[PDB]
Amino acid sequence: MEMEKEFEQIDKSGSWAAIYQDIRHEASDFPSRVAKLPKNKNRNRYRDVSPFDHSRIKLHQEDNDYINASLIKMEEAQRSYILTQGPLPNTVGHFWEMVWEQKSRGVVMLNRVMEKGSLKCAQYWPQKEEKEMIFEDTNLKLTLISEDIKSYYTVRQLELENLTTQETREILHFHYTTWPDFGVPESPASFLNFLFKVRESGSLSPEHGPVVVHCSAGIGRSGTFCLADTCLLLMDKRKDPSSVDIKKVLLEMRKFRMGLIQTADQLRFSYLAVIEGAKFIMGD
Numbered sequence: 001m002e003m004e005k006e007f008e009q010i011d012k013s014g015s016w017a018a019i020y021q022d023i024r025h026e027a028s029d030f031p032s033r034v035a036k037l038p039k040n041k042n043r044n045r046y047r048d049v050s051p052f053d054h055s056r057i058k059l060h061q062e063d064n065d066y067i068n069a070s071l072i073k074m075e076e077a078q079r080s081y082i083l084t085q086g087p088l089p090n091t092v093g094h095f096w097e098m099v100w101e102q103k104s105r106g107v108v109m110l111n112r113v114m115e116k117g118s119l120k121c122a123q124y125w126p127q128k129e130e131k132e133m134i135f136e137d138t139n140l141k142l143t144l145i146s147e148d149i150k151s152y153y154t155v156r157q158l159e160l161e162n163l164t165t166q167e168t169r170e171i172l173h174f175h176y177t178t179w180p181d182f183g184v185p186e187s188p189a190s191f192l193n194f195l196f197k198v199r200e201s202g203s204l205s206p207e208h209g210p211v212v213v214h215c216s217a218g219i220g221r222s223g224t225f226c227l228a229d230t231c232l233l234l235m236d237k238r239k240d241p242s243s244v245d246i247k248k249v250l251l252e253m254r255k256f257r258m259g260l261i262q263t264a265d266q267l268r269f270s271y272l273a274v275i276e277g278a279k280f281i282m283g284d
């Protein structure tokens with residue numbers, strides 16, 4: 001079926017939970033043996049969210065190459081994404097090592113450091129120009145260059161230096177700051193505006209390594225971001241945009257990381273975002 005009318009048909013029939021459970025039943029199951037080794041326990045935030053072995057990002061280190069991060073490679077859309085958990089106190093150096101080694105231009109953050117009165121990820125970037133951060137375990141230096149605070153999101157320019165070689169690179173930090181502590185946003189308009197700002201920066205384009213996107217577990221909000229982006233790109237590429245099937249795209253993405261889209265409300269919100277976004281790309 002088309003998307004917008006499938007949407008109203010699920011609303012009128014109130015069957016979002018049943019649709020979402022079908023997706024959960026049909027989703028791929030692949031091994032995640034490296035994630036579960038005892039030496040990696042303090043590298044995982046949640047015991048039930050792990051990267052598959054076949055798609056995990058490897059650190060370029062011989063001691064321990066493990067990080068909780070996955071490469072989502074979308075062949076028809078010609079887009080790749082790295083989805084990862086919010087960094088932990090003992091993985092902030094690994095996180096920036098990955099950004100460096102994978103040649104990423106941008107980092108997309110979809111959570112606040114504290115939500116619901118608890119810490120959802122480490123404070124992993126510097127908050128003042130004159131107070132830079134050094135990660136001694138991976139030999140990297142990180143400096144805040146500039147910061148632009150808007151009503152729904154903040155963009156930061158950061159300088160990452162590899163202290164072994166003295167090479168430097170400019171990284172863009174795109175921080176969506178207004179996702180509610182509970183539920184999903186009422187309108188997708190600010191989330192879509194944010195996606196378009198990431199696109200306009202070059203961070204999603206083939207001349208760079210894959211964008212790094214995270215929330216707390218790296219599957220829920222993060223899944224919503226890449227699902228909406230890929231669906232909108234396919235609607236632009238194909239002769240028949242009504243052939244784009246958001247449930248089939250989501251199942252393709254779940255071949256590369258488990259659990260993408262965590263609730264039926266996140267699934268409904270993803271439909272809403274793609275539907276409204278497709279009108280702006282052209283005009284209604």
Ligand SMILES: O=C(O)c1ccc(OCc2ccccc2)cc1
Nearest residue numbers: 002003232235236241242278281
């Ligand atoms: O009739 C439909 O079922 C439909 C028609 C057009 C359409 O395209 C939306 C779009 C998105 C992004 C760029 C250009 C067009 C999607 C679905």
